[PDB]
Amino acid sequence: DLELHPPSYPWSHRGLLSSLDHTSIRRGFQVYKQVCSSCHSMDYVAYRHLVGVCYTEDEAKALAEEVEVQDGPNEDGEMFMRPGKLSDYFPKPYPNPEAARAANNGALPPDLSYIVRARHGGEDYVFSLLTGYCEPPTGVSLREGLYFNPYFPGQAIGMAPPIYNEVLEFDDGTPATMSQVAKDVCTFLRWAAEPEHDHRKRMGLKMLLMMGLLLPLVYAMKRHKWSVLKSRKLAYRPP
Amino acid sequence: MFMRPGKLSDYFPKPYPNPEAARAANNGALPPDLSYIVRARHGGEDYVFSLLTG
Amino acid sequence: PTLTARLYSLLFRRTSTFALTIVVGALFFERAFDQGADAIYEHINEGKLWKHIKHKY
Amino acid sequence: LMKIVNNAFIDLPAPSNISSWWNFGSLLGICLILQILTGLFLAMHYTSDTTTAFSSVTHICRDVNYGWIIRYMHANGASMFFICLYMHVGRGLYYGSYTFLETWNIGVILLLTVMATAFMGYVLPWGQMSFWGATVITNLLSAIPYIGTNLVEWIWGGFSVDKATLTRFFAFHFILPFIIMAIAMVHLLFLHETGSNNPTGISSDVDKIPFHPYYTIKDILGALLLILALMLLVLFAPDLLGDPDNYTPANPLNTPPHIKPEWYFLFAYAILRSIPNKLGGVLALAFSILILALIPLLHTSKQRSMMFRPLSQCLFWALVADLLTLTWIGGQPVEHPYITIGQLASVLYFLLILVLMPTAGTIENKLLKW
Amino acid sequence: LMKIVNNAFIDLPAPSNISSWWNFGSLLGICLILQILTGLFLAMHYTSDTTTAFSSVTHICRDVNYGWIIRYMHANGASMFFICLYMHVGRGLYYGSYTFLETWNIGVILLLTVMATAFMGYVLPWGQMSFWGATVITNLLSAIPYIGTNLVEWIWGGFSVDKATLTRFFAFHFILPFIIMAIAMVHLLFLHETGSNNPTGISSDVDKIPFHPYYTIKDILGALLLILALMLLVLFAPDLLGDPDNYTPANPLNTPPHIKPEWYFLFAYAILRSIPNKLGGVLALAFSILILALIPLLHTSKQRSMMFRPLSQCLFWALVADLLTLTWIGGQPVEHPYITIGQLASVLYFLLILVLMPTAGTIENKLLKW
Amino acid sequence: RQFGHLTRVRHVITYSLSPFEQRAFPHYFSKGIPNVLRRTRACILRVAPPFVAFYLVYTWGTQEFEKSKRKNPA
Amino acid sequence: RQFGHLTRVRHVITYSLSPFEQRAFPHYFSKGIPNVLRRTRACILRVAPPFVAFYLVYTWGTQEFEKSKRKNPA
Amino acid sequence: KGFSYLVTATTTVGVAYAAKNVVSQFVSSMSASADVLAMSKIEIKLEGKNMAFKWRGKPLFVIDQEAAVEVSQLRDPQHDLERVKKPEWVILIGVCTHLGCVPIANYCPCHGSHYDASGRIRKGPAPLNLEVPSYEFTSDDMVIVG
Ligand code: HEC
Ligand code: HEC
Ligand code: HEM
Ligand code: HEM
Ligand code: HEM
Ligand code: HEM
Ligand SMILES: Cc1nc(CO)c(-c2ccc(Oc3cccc(OC(F)(F)F)c3)cc2)c(O)c1Cl
Ligand SMILES: Cc1nc(CO)c(-c2ccc(Oc3cccc(OC(F)(F)F)c3)cc2)c(O)c1Cl
C-alpha cells in the first residue's frame, strides 16, 4: 500500500566533485554478463564505450570476439553469424519483449540503460531492491513466480532472486558477497545512464573557478561605472 | 512470428527479402522496383513499352 | 612607480596593445587553468580515474 | 546607416532608479537566442520518427562529442526561461506596468505561444510521459461540444498520438521561437514610444539616462548569474526538475501510477484537476491565463505602483503563495487532503485578482482623499 | 500605432513610369512566403532519417489528403523563385540599379544564401542524385589545401554523406528562409532612404506617386500570372525540370551515367567543368557570383541606364545568351564538341563584364563629350 | 521620406480625369498594335542576334555531337 | 524619442565625479548592512506570512496525507 | 587608471577562455560522432569476382599479365606491386579520379576511363591511377583497411 523511500547511502561518487571508482565499474561489468545479460536487453551501449573507462581496447575486443552477432547479407542472399566486434552493441538476450514475457511469468525485464535515472532514487533503490528480499509478512499471499520485496511498488514482483552469495567469482578475487556485487553493479548502471560523469565534474569544476573569479570583477566593473551616480549630490538654487 | 492472410492495409507481398537474393536468384543482376520507374526513366511509358517490344 | 603604473603606460594605454595583451594572457591562462583543475579533480578523486588504473591493463 | 535604430539600444533614455528585476526582462533575449542556438545544433541529430527518436536522443547523449551537454543546456535552459517570466510577469503587477495597455496584451501572446511551444518540446523524445502528457493535455479539447472530437482527432492525425503527431509538432515547434523572436521586437516597439515604467510609477523623464555603459553591463551581470544558475543544473543536477520517467520509452499500454506534466504547468494544471467537471474546469484554465488581459480594466488606485500601497503588498505576495501552492498541489496525486486545498486555492487565485486587489485601491484612494 | 511604418507600403512615393519588370522584385515576397507555407505543412510528415525519408516522401505523394500537391507547389515553386531572380538580377544591370551600393551587396548575400539553401533542399529525399549531387558539389571544397579534407569530413560528419549529413541539412535548411525573411527586410530598408530607380536612371522625384491602389493591384496581377505559371507545372508537367532520377532511392555503389544538379546551377557548374584543373576552376565559380559585388566599381558612363546606351544593349543581351548557353552546356556531358564551347563561353562571361561593358561607357561618354 | 520636401516645381499644370468617366481600354487594338511594332523595331536588332547565334550553337553543337558517336570507316 | 524635448527643468544643479577619482566600494560593509536591515524591516511583515502559512500547509498536507494510508483499528 | 582597467582586461581574459571552449564544444558536434569512427578504420574482409563493398560510405574494390603493362607508358608512372602489398589482393578506393563516381570492375562509366584488373589507368580522362588506402593484413584470411 505504501511506497518505500530508500535511504541516502554514501558512495564513491555522491559528492559534487566525486567521480566513479572505475575499478568498481570493472567487476560490475562481469556481473552483467554472467547474470543479467540472459534477460536484460541493454541495447543503448556497445563494448567500445567501455574503453578508457573499465577495460582496454584488446581486452574489450576479446569480449566481442567471444559472442556471436547476426550481421551481413551474404552474396547468396542470406544472413549469418560472426564474432562480435567493438562497434556492435551488447548482444540482446531475446528478439522481442513478448518472448521475454513468455520465458517468464508474463512479465518483462526493463532495460537497464537508463533505469537508474528513470526510477526514483536510482542507485539506492536498485541496491536496496536486491538487498531487500525477505520472507513475506503475516497475512500476505502471492501467486507463483512472484516474490516479495517492499521497495518495488505493490510489494509484489516477478523478480526471481538473481544474486546470491558467491553466485560467481571475479577476476582480481575480491569477496564476491551479495553486497560487493551490488555495489559494483549499481556503480556500473550509473555509468550506463551517464557516460559523462567523469567529464561532467571537470567542467563541473572549471566553471566555478572562472565564474567565482569573474563574477566579482564584473561586479566591480558594474560598480566602476555606476559609481558616478552612486555618488551624486543634487541641489535646488532658485532666486 | 507467424503468417496470416493479407489484408488491404498490407503492401504488395515482396518477392524476395533483400536485393542480394534477387541477384543470386538471377545472373547477379537486380530487378529495379516499378513503383516510380516510369518517372525515373527517360520517356517512361514509351521506353518501357518499346523495351518489352524490342 | 608601482607595477600598476608601469603596467598602464606599457599595455593598458594604447588600445591596440590592450587587445594584444588579453589574448596573450588568455593563451597562457588556458595552459594553467586546465592543468590546475585536471590535477585537483585528479587529486580529489585519487584512486578512481582511468589513468590511475591505466597500468594494470 | 540603419544602425541609428540602435538609438533604441545605445543612446536610449531610461531611468536611473532601476533594480536588478528588469534584468529578467532582458535575459529572455538571451534565453531565446541561447535556446535556439543550442536546440539548432541539437536538432542536427534528432529524428522526427518514433522508432528512432528515443535512440536519436541517446545518439546525442552518448556518441556525440559534447552532444550530451546540449540536451541539458537546452532543456533546463527552457526552465530558467520560465523562472524569469514568473518574476517578470509578477513584476508589472507589483510595479504597475500593465497600464501600458498596448504592451501587456503582447505579454500574453508571447506566453501562450510558449505554453503551447514548451509543451511540444517535452513530447519529442517519447519519455513515457511525453505520450501521456501529450494525451492528458490534448484530450481536454475533446470537452468542447460538436467539435472537440473532430479537432483532437484532426490534431491526432487520426484517433490518438502516433508517428504523425510527433512530426506535426517538431515542425510546429522548431518554428515558433522565431515567431517569438519577431513578436518580441513588437513587444519592444510599443514600449519605445513611452519607455520604461519605474518602481515608483512616476514619469521620471527628468532623470532619464543612457543605456550603453550602465544597463548593458548590468544586463551582462544579470546574464552572468543566469549562466551560473544554468550551469549548476546541467553540471550538478540535470535530473532535478525533469521527471525521471522521461528516459523510459513510451508505450500506450502502460501508464505510470502518478502523472504530472513538467513542473511549470502545475499552477494551472491543478486548477483543472480541482474541478471534477471536465469542461467547466477547462475554461478556468484558459481564463487562469487570459485574466492577465482583464487586469488593466481593474486598476483602481490613482497611484500606479505597489511600493506605495502596503495593503496591496499584503495581497500580492499572498498570490505568490497560492501559486507556489498550486505549483505543488498539482504535482501531487488526487487524494482527499489535497483536493480540499485545490478547491480553495484555485478559487483564491481568481478571488485575489478580481475582488480584493481592486478593493485595496478603492480603499487606499479613500484613506488619502481622492 | 506601428502601422505608420506602412507608410513604406501604403503612402510611399514611387515613380509612375514603371514596367511590369519590378513585379518580379515583389513576387519573391510571395514565393518566399508561399514556399515556407507549403514546405511547413510538407515537413509535418518528412523524416530526417535515411531508411524512412524516401518513404516519408511517398507517405505524402500517395496517402495524404492532397499532400501530393504540396511537394510540387514547393519544388517547382522553388524554380519559379529563380526565374524571377535571373530576371530581377539582370534588371539592375540593364537599368543601372547596382549604383545603390548599400543595396546591391545585400542582393548578393540573399543569393548565396539561397544557392546554399536550395542545394540543401534537393538532397533531403535521397533521389540517387541527391547523394551524388551532394557529393559532387560538396567534394569541391576538398580542393582547398590543408583544410579541404578537414572541413568536408567535418560537414560529412565523418568520411562521406550518410544519415548524419542529411539531418545536418534539414535543420540548416528549414531555418535559413527565415534568415532570408529577415535580411529581405534589410534589403528594403536601405532602399527606403532613396526609393526606387527608374528605367531612365533619372531622379523622378517630381513624379512620385502612391502605392496602395496602383502598384498593389499590379503586383497582384504579377502574382496572378505567377500562380498561373506555377499551377501549369505542378498540374501539367511536374516532371519537366526536376530530373527523373530523383525518384530512385540512393545507393553509393551505383552512379548514373550522366550527372547534373538541378538546372539552375548549370550556368555556374559548367564554368567549373570547363577548367580541367580542380581548384583554379572553383575560384572562378565563387567569383562567377561575387563578381556582382565588383560591378559598381566599373560604372563608367556618367549616364545610368542602358535604355539610353544602345551599344551596351548589344553586349547585355549577349551576356544573356552566354548564360543560356552555359545553362545548357553544363547540362550535357563532357565531350569534345562542348568542351570547346565552355572554354570560350565561361571566358566570355568574365570577359563581357570586366572589359567591354566598361569600355562602352568609356566610348559613349566620348561620343557625347564628357 | 515622404511627400512634402522632395524637390521643387514651378509653373506646371496637371489635367487628370476619373476612371468612371472613361473607358478602361480605349484604342487597345487601334493605337496599341502600331505601338507594339514601333516598340518592337527599336529593340529587335540588339536583342536577337545573340539568341540567333545560340540557335546555331545549339544546332551545330548537337549535330557535331551526333557524328562523333557514329563509327568511322576503319 | 530621445534627449532634447522630453520635459522641462529649471534651476537645478548636478554634482558628479569621475569613477577613477573614487573607490568603487566605499562603506560597503559599514553603511550597507544597516541599510540591508532597514530595507528588510520594511518588507518582511507583508512578505513572509503567506509563505509562513505555506510552510504549515506543506506541513499539515503531508502529515495528514501520511496518516490516511496507515490502517485503522478495524 | 591602471587598476580599474586591469579589471576590464582580466575579465576579458576569462571571457575568451569560456568562449574558446564552448564554441569548440558545438563545433565538435558537427564533427563526426563516436559511432562513425568505430566504423572508420575497421573493415574485417575475407578470386575472379568484382568485390565492391561499402566502407566509410565509400566503395572498397577488391598479375600474370598485369605486370606486362609498361609503367613509363602510363599517364601516371606507378607499378602494380607499389600499389599492393600482396600481389593477388588488389585494394583501392573506388573513386573515379575525374569527378567522383563509381567505376565498374570488368571502369569509370560516367566518362569511360579504362582500368586494369589492378585498377591502374590505361585510358583516361582519369589522370591518376585510382587511390589506394593504407591498410594492414593481420592474417591471410582477414584485412584491416585503414
Ligand atoms: C532470471 C533472469 C534474470 C536475472 C538472472 C536477472 N534479472 Fe533482473 N529482472 C528479470 C525479470 C524477469 C525482471 C522483472 C521484474 C518485474 O517485472 O518487476 C527483472 C527486473 C529487474 C530490475 C527492475 C527493477 C524494477 O523496478 O522493476 C532490475 C533493476 C534488475 N532486474 C536488475 C538485475 C540485476 C542487478 C541482476 C543481477 C544481480 C539481475 N537483474 C539478474 C530477469 C532477470
Ligand atoms: C525473370 C524475373 C522477371 C520477370 C518475370 C520480370 N522481370 Fe523485369 N527485371 C528482372 C530483372 C532480373 C531485371 C534486371 C534488368 C537489368 O538489370 O538491366 C529487370 C528489369 C526490368 C525493368 C528495368 C528496365 C531498366 O531500364 O533496367 C523493367 C521496367 C521491367 N523489368 C519490367 C518488367 C515487366 C513489364 C515484366 C513483365 C512483362 C517483367 N519486368 C517481368 C526480372 C524480371
Ligand atoms: C521557448 C522555446 C522552447 C521550449 C520551451 C522547448 C522545450 C523543450 C524541452 C522542455 C525539452 C526537454 C527534452 C528533454 O529534456 O529531454 C526540449 C527538447 C528538444 N528541443 Fe525543444 N523547446 C524550445 C525550443 C526549441 C528550439 C528553438 C529547438 C531547436 C532550435 C528545439 C528542439 C528540441 C529538440 C529536437 C528536442 C528533443 C531533445 C530532447 O527531448 O531532449 N526546441 N524542448
Ligand atoms: C520572449 C519573451 C519576452 C521577451 C523577449 C521580453 C522582453 C522584454 C524586455 C527586454 C523588456 C524591457 C525590460 C523591462 O522593461 O523590464 C520588457 C518589458 C516588459 N515586458 Fe517582457 N518580454 C517577454 C515576455 C513578456 C511577457 C510574457 C510579459 C507578460 C505580461 C511581458 C510583459 C512586459 C511588460 C509589461 C513590460 C513593461 C516594461 C516596463 O514596465 O518598463 N513580457 N519585455
Ligand atoms: C528558398 C527556399 C527553399 C528552396 C530553394 C528549397 C528547395 C527544395 C527543393 C528544390 C526541393 C525538391 C524536392 C523534390 O522536388 O522532390 C525541396 C524539397 C523539400 N523542402 Fe525544401 N527548399 C526551400 C525551403 C524549404 C522550406 C522553407 C521548407 C519548409 C518550410 C522546406 C522543406 C522541404 C522538405 C522537407 C523537402 C523534402 C520534400 C521533397 O524532397 O520533395 N524547404 N526543397
Ligand atoms: C528573397 C530575395 C529578395 C527579395 C524578397 C527582394 C525584394 C525586393 C523588392 C520588393 C524590391 C523592390 C522592387 C524593385 O525595386 O523592383 C527589390 C529591389 C531591388 N532588389 Fe531584390 N529582392 C530579393 C533578392 C534580390 C537579389 C538576389 C538581388 C541581387 C542583386 C536584389 C537586388 C535588388 C536591387 C538592386 C533592387 C533595387 C531597386 C531599384 O532599382 O529600384 N534583390 N528587392
Ligand atoms: C529599459 C530597457 N529597455 C530596453 C529596450 O528599450 C532593453 C533592451 C535592450 C536591448 C535589447 O536587445 C535585445 C538583445 C538580445 C535579444 C533580444 O531579443 C531579440 F530576440 F533580439 F528580439 C533583444 C532588448 C531590450 C533593456 O534591457 C532595458 Cl533594461
Ligand atoms: C517600388 C516598390 N517598393 C516596394 C517597397 O519599397 C515594394 C514592396 C512592397 C511591399 C513589400 O512587402 C512585402 C510583402 C510580401 C512579402 C514581403 O517579404 C517579406 F515580408 F519581407 F518577407 C514583403 C515589399 C516591397 C514594391 O513591391 C515596389 Cl514595386
Q: Which helix (H) or strand (E) holds G15?
A: strand G13-16
Please report which residue ranges of chain B form alpha helices under DSSP H.
19-24, 45-52
DSSP category for residue D295: G
CATH architecture observed for domain F1-74: Up-down Bundle (1.20)
CATH architecture observed for domain E1-370: Up-down Bundle (1.20)
Strands H121-123 and H135-139: unpaired
Annotated binding site of H for [2Fe-2S] cluster: 96, 98, 108, 111, 113
D47:E44 CB<8 A: no
Give residue ranges with CB within 6 A of ligand 1. A 31, 35-36, 38-40, 104, 107, 109-110, 112, 115, 119, 126, 129-130, 152, 157-160, 162-163, 185
Name the 3-class secondary structure at E61: helix
H100:E153 CB<8 A: no
CB-closest option in G15, G25, G26 to A232: G15
Q: Determine the distance separating the centroid of ligand 4 and the alpha carbon of A73, expressed in angstroms.
A: 60
DSSP category for residue E60: I
For residues D44 and E169, give the distance between their C-alpha atoms in angstroms, rounded to a whole number: 7
Q: Determine the distance separating the centroid of ligand 2 and the alpha carbon of B31, expressed in angstroms.
A: 6
H91: amino acid identity, one letter? I
Residue E191 Cβ < 6 Å to ligand 8: yes
Which residues in chain G have Cβ-Cβ distances shorter than 8 Å to A231?
16-17, 22, 26
Calculate how close chain C gets to H136, using CA atoms only, in Å: 25
Q: Please answer whether residues E295 and H72 qualify as being in contact, where contact means their C-beta atoms are separated by less than 8 angstroms.
A: no
CB-closest option in B16, B17, B20 to A75: B20
Alpha-carbon distances, residue H23 vs D219, E61, E334 (angstroms): 22, 41, 43
For residues D316 and D357, give the distance between their C-alpha atoms in angstroms, rounded to a whole number: 8
Closest-CA residue of H relative to E172 is H30
For residues D358 and D352, give the distance between their C-alpha atoms in angstroms, rounded to a whole number: 9
Alpha-carbon distances, residue A56 vs A48, A51, C47, D176 (angstroms): 9, 5, 18, 47
Annotated binding site of A for heme c: 36, 39-40, 159
DSSP states along H14-28: HHHHHHHHHHHHHHH
From the list E52, A43, E126, A44, the residue with the least C-alpha distance to D49 is E52
Which residues in chain E have Cβ-Cβ distances shorter than 8 Å to B42?
244
Q: Determine the distance separating the centroid of ligand 3 and the alpha carbon of E133, expressed in angstroms.
A: 32
From the list A8, A11, A50, A19, the residue with the least C-alpha distance to A204 is A19
Calculate how close chain D gets to E168, using CA atoms only, in Å: 4
Residue D220's contacts (CB-CB under 8 Å, 6 or more residues apart) are A218
Domain extents in chain D = 1-370
Looking at the CA of E116, which ligand is closest? 5
D328:G58 CB<8 A: yes
Residue carrying the nine cell digits 533521389: E127
- Report the nearest-CA residue for atom 21 of ligand 1: A109
Total domains in the fold of chain A: 2
D262 is catalytic: yes
Give the range of the structural domain holding residue A164, as residue numbers without chain letter: 1-195
Residue E342 Cβ < 6 Å to ligand 5: no
G13 and chain A: CB distance < 8 Å anywhere? Answer: yes
Closest-CA residue of E relative to H111 is E334
Which residues in chain E have Cβ-Cβ distances shorter than 8 Å to H111?
334
Name the 3-class secondary structure at F42: coil
For residues E126 and E57, give the distance between their C-alpha atoms in angstroms, rounded to a whole number: 10
* C-alpha cell belonging to residue F11: 509653373
B40:E239 CB<8 A: no
* C-alpha cell belonging to residue D112: 501562450
Looking at the CA of D192, which ligand is closest? 7
Pick the residue of E247, E251, E253 with the most B CBs within 10 A to test the interface with B by mutation.
Answer: E247
Name the 3-class secondary structure at E365: helix
Q: At CA D295, angle to CA D292 and CA D301, rounded to 5?
A: 150
E164 and chain D: CB distance < 8 Å anywhere? Answer: yes
Q: Determine the distance separating the centroid of ligand 7 and the alpha carbon of G2, expressed in angstroms.
A: 17
Q: Determine the distance separating the centroid of ligand 1 and the alpha carbon of D242, expressed in angstroms.
A: 25
For residues H61 and H103, give the distance between their C-alpha atoms in angstroms, rounded to a whole number: 9
From the list D188, D349, D337, D336, the residue with the least C-alpha distance to D267 is D349
* C-alpha cell belonging to residue E194: 532613396
Which residues in chain G have Cβ-Cβ distances shorter than 8 Å to A227?
19, 22-24
Which residues in chain B have Cβ-Cβ distances shorter than 8 Å to E248?
32, 36, 40
From the list A52, A46, A56, the residue with the least C-alpha distance to A86 is A46
Closest-CA residue of H relative to E135 is H100
Technique of determination: cryo-EM
Q: Determine the distance separating the centroid of ligand 3 and the alpha carbon of E35, expressed in angstroms.
A: 25
Give the range of the structural domain holding residue C55, as residue numbers without chain letter: 1-57
DSSP category for residue D354: I
For residues C47 and C43, give the distance between their C-alpha atoms in angstroms, rounded to a whole number: 9
What count of Cα atoms within 13 Å lies in the side-chain half-sphere of residue E73?
Answer: 21
* C-alpha cell belonging to residue D86: 514568473
Sign of the CA dihedral C41, C45, C46, C48? negative
From the list A6, A50, A5, the residue with the least C-alpha distance to A28 is A50
B45: amino acid identity, one letter? E
D228 and chain H: CB distance < 8 Å anywhere? Answer: no
Q: Which helix (H) or strand (E) holds H144?
A: strand H142-145
Q: Please answer whether residues A112 and A42 qualify as being in contact, where contact means their C-beta atoms are separated by less than 8 angstroms.
A: yes
For residues D137 and D160, give the distance between their C-alpha atoms in angstroms, rounded to a whole number: 13
For residues D160 and D153, give the distance between their C-alpha atoms in angstroms, rounded to a whole number: 7
Q: What is the CATH number of the domain that holds A69?
A: 1.10.760.10
Q: Please answer whether residues E240 and B39 qualify as being in contact, where contact means their C-beta atoms are separated by less than 8 angstroms.
A: no
- For residue E40, give the ligand 5 atom closest to its CA: 30
Q: Please answer whether residues D66 and H22 qualify as being in contact, where contact means their C-beta atoms are separated by less than 8 angstroms.
A: no
Give all chains having 3 or more CB-to-CB distances under 8 Å with chain A: B, C, D, G, H
For residues D340 and G64, give the distance between their C-alpha atoms in angstroms, rounded to a whole number: 12
Sign of the CA dihedral D309, D314, D317, D323? negative
Q: What are phi and psi of A169, to 5 degrees?
A: -145, 140
If asked whether residues A35 and A1 sit together in one domain, one would say yes
* Domain H33-146 grouped into CATH 3.40.630.10: no
- For residue E8, give the ligand 8 atom closest to its CA: 6
Looking at the CA of D78, which ligand is closest? 3
Chain D from 174 to 203: CB within 8 A of any G CB: 192-193, 195, 203
If asked whether residues A43 and A71 sit together in one domain, one would say yes
Give the resolution value in Å.
4.1
E244 and chain B: CB distance < 8 Å anywhere? Answer: yes
From the list A171, A136, A161, A130, the residue with the least C-alpha distance to A29 is A171
3-state SS of chain A is CCCCCCCCCCCCCCCCCCCCCHHHHHHHHHHHHHCHHHCCCCCCCEHHHCECCCECHHHHHHHHHHCEEEEEECCCCCEEEEECCCCCECCCCCCCHHHHHHCCCCCCCCCCCCCCCCCCCCHHHHHHHHCCCCCCCCCCCCCCCCECCCCCHHHCECCCCCCCCCCCCCCCCCCCCHHHHHHHHHHHHHHHCCCCHHHHHHHHHHHHHHHHHHHHHHHHHHHHHHHHHHCEEEECCCC
Closest-CA residue of E relative to H96 is E255
What count of Cα atoms within 13 Å lies in the side-chain half-sphere of residue D341?
Answer: 30
Active-site residue numbers of E?
192, 196, 218-219, 262
* C-alpha cell belonging to residue H14: 576569462
Calculate how close chain G gets to D335, using CA atoms only, in Å: 8
If interface means Cβ-Cβ distance under 8 Å, which residues of chain G face chain H?
19-20, 24
Alpha-carbon distances, residue D311 vs A1, A132, D292, D339, E158 (angstroms): 47, 56, 21, 30, 65
